[PDB]
From a paper:
Anti-apoptotic members of the Bcl-2 family are broadly recognized as promising cancer therapeutic targets. Human anti-apoptotic proteins Bcl-2, Bcl-xL, Bcl-w, Mcl-1 and Bfl-1 have a globular, helical fold and function by binding to short, α-helical Bcl-2 homology 3 ([name]) motifs in pro-apoptotic proteins, as shown in Figure 1A. Competition for binding among [name]-containing proteins regulates mitochondrial outer membrane permeabilization (MOMP), which is an irreversible step toward caspase activation and cell death. The role of anti-apoptotic protein Bfl-1 in cancer is less characterized than that of Mcl-1 or Bcl-xL, but many lines of evidence suggest that Bfl-1 is also a critical target. Thus, Bfl-1 is an intriguing therapeutic target and biomarker for resistance to cytotoxic anticancer drugs.
Crystals of the Mcl-1/FS2 peptide complex were grown at room temperature in hanging drops over a reservoir containing 0.2 M zinc sulfate, 0.1 M imidazole (pH 6.5), and 3% 6-aminohexanoic acid. Crystals were cryoprotected by transferring into 15% glycerol, 0.2 M zinc sulfate, 0.1 M imidazole (pH 6.5) and 3% 6-aminohexanoic acid prior to flash freezing. For example, the structures of FS2 bound to Bfl-1 can be used to design chemical crosslinks to reinforce helicity and promote cellular uptake, the structure of FS2 bound to Mcl-1 can be used to further reduce Mcl-1 binding, and the structure of FS2_1fX can be used as a platform for the design of therapeutic peptides and small molecules that covalently target Bfl-1.
Residue numbers in the entry:
A (entry chain C): 1 to 23
B (entry chain A): 170 to 325
């Protein structure tokens, strides 16, 4: 399903952003 | 009248999307709660631009799936944003990522048609963000919390 696949990638990117902040 | 959070949100998001799609700054400094809005936009420029740089190829893949399966990108993007938050997790990292991808979509729309306006995309993003996370945004002090979360306090 296309919606899930896109959301999954954005979640991975967002998690990357959060890891950067508290480093 | 009413709803200062929605207005403020839309102004910050509209200008960022408008800059990114056209490549020009609005000038037109401030209005209403300018200081917070001015720092939020600069924070959005720094983080937003970085997210798009660092995940450019991933965004291209999402963009392709977005175009092929359904007709309207703004309607389709809304589906994505809701699903992103469907697990019940909310944080600034996710919010800024969704705005960053919206800016990516805005560029794409200006390429396929140079006359396309960004307002429908921006107001749709602002609609999801403000309506569905109203009280959460309020608890984080709105855009003051957004600014501080992404503000590096010591360079050393
Ligand atoms: Zn899901
Ligand atoms: Zn990243
Ligand atoms: Zn498209
Ligand atoms: Zn600070």
């Amino acid at each position: 399903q296309w919606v899930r696949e896109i959301a999954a990638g954005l979640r991975r990117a967002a998690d990357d952003v959060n890891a950067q902040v508290e480093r | 009248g009413s709803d200062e959070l929605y207005r403020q949100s839309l102004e910050i998001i509209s200008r960022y999307l408008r800059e990114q799609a056209t490549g020009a700054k609005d000038t037109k400094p401030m209005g209403r709660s300018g200081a917070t809005s001015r720092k939020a936009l600069e924070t959005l420029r720094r983080v937003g631009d970085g997210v798009q740089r660092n995940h450019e190829t991933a965004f291209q893949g999402m963009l392709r799936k977005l175009d092929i399966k359904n007709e309207d990108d703004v309607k389709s993007l809304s589906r994505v944003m809701i699903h992103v938050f469907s697990d019940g997790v909310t944080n600034w990292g996710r919010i800024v990522t969704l705005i960053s991808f919206g800016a990516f979509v805005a560029k794409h729309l200006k390429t396929i048609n140079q006359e396309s306006c960004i307002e429908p995309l921006a107001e749709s993003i602002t609609d999801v963000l403000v309506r569905t996370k109203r009280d959460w945004l309020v608890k984080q002090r709105g855009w003051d919390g957004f600014v501080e979360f992404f503000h590096v306090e010591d360079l050393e």
